[PDB]
């Protein structure tokens, strides 16, 4: 059983600087090269940094060479990755994934294991608290419902209905973009005998800033 | 820099289906790789070597090519493999992955389930004014919505969004906002929504009055 766990990740302005992690578990860690692997928001993959067995050779593409740093701890089973005069391209999510062993008599440059990566976002933004607005028919036996959180920054944010209780017909649609704000909406379907007869609650989250708003849904 | 192209960008495949992908590369390369990356989940390794399965693979997929074209095959298609597909070369430096294909579930066409809502009088307060349409639940992605401002067209101020497919239903749900001003809002009266689908010919049409409730 193999484990691949990062950290560090989170908001900074254009030129700041972060330190990530890479936490090893079930492999003998002083025996692999490990490497660090991000995804564009466009969903594009790309190696960023990479490794050897100890501290000695290190790789770094010319898109990111002279300004990220990617060290190792073997006797701490750790993983870092420095990073500084982080531009806009540098906002992704960073893997930390393995790669051959050292002596495999012939190196695939392959990564078999990967991890869940830690999201980093890298903008001159300002972090704001998003607006919860409730979704209701102004006036067919099921009824859909919804919630708008529009203008927050940055990523992510997490909504529930009933405080989780109510998944099926739940969806949440990927946020959008647009004058350094990001906007979600997400809706639910329910009987008609269940509202508005019962309460039905938007539970949004935002860690960011760190806020958190329930929101009923009244008919009208 | 070695340019990995992945055709096609997206593609659907039916269960028991053939589905077969290519990634062609500006240079010759000696290998090529492939991984399978699936949302909630980390990208997987797939294919290694052109043609080598790793650890725990189902023997339907299969790699082949060489020189400067390389394909990823799998027999029959089924659910468990719809995920995006990256093919990597690994024999120049850096390492770099191909742009990457989108293989989706074909099911049965399923119409969308309209539902528009005015904006909460919580908007209002701040000046704005968003109305939103939600279409929930139909095959295959590709919708066109539409709106309306008594009966004229509006197409700046709109903000779609698609989810990726259910694993349930295989179905796909997308979401309209149209954003406004307060005064903007309080000047017109009829807030239509239409939407046009493979399996509805003419629109479905779902509107409100100001002068109601
Ligand atoms: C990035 C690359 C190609 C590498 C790493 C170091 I450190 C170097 O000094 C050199 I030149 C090249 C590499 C990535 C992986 I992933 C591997 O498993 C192996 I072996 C090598």
């Known amino acids: 059983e193999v484990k691949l766990e990062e950290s560090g990740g989170g908001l900074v302005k254009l030129g700041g600087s972060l330190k990530l992690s890479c936490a090893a578990s079930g492999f003998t860690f002083s025996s692999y090269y490990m490497s660090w692997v991000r995804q564009t928001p466009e969903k594009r993959l790309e190696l960023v940094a990479a490794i050897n067995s100890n501290g000695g050779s290190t790789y770094y593409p010319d898109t990111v060479k002279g300004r990220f740093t990617i060290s190792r701890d073997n006797a701490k089973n750790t993983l870092y990755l420095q990073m500084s005069s982080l531009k806009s391209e540098d906002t992704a999510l960073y893997y930390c994934?393995?790669?051959?062993?050292?002596?495999?008599?012939?190196?695939?440059?392959?990564?078999?294991?990967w991890g869940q990566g830690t999201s980093v976002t890298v903008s001159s933004a300002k972090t704001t608290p998003p607006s919860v607005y409730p979704l209701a028919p102004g006036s067919n036996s099921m009824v859909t419902l919804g919630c708008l959180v529009k203008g927050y920054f940055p990523e992510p944010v997490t909504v529930t209905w009933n405080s989780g209780s109510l998944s099926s017909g739940v969806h949440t649609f990927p946020a959008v973009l647009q004058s350094d704000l990001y906007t979600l909406s997400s809706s639910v379907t329910v009987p008609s005998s269940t509202w508005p007869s019962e309460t039905v609650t938007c539970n949004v989250a935002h860690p960011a800033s760190s806020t958190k708003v329930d929101k009923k849904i009244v008919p009208r | 820099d070695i340019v990995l192209n992945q055709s096609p960008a997206i593609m659907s495949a039916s269960p028991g289906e053939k589905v077969t992908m290519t990634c062609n590369s500006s240079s010759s390369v000696s290998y090529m790789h492939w991984y399978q990356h699936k949302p909630g989940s980390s990208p997987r390794l797939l294919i290694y070597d052109t043609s080598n399965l790793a650890s725990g693979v189902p023997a339907r997929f299969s790699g082949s090519g060489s020189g400067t074209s390389y394909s990823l095959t799998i027999s029959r298609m089924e659910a468990e493999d719809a995920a995006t597909y990256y093919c990597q070369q690994r024999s120049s430096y850096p390492l770099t992955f191909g742009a990457g294909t989108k293989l989706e579930i074909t099911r049965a066409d399923a119409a969308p389930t309209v539902s528009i809502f005015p904006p909460s009088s919580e908007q209002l307060t701040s000046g704005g004014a968003s109305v939103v349409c939600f279409l929930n639940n139909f095959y295959p992605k590709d919708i066109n919505v539409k709106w309306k401002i008594d009966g004229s067209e509006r197409q700046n101020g709109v903000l779609n969004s698609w989810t990726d497919q259910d694993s349930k239903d295989s179905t796909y749900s997308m979401s309209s906002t149209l954003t406004l001003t307060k005064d903007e809002y309080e000047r017109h009266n009829s807030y239509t929504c239409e939407a046009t689908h493979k399996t509805s010919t003419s629109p479905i049409v779902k509107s409100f009055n100001r002068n109601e409730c």
């Open positions: 994934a393995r790669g051959d062993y050292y002596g495999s008599s012939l190196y695939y440059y392959a990564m078999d294991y």
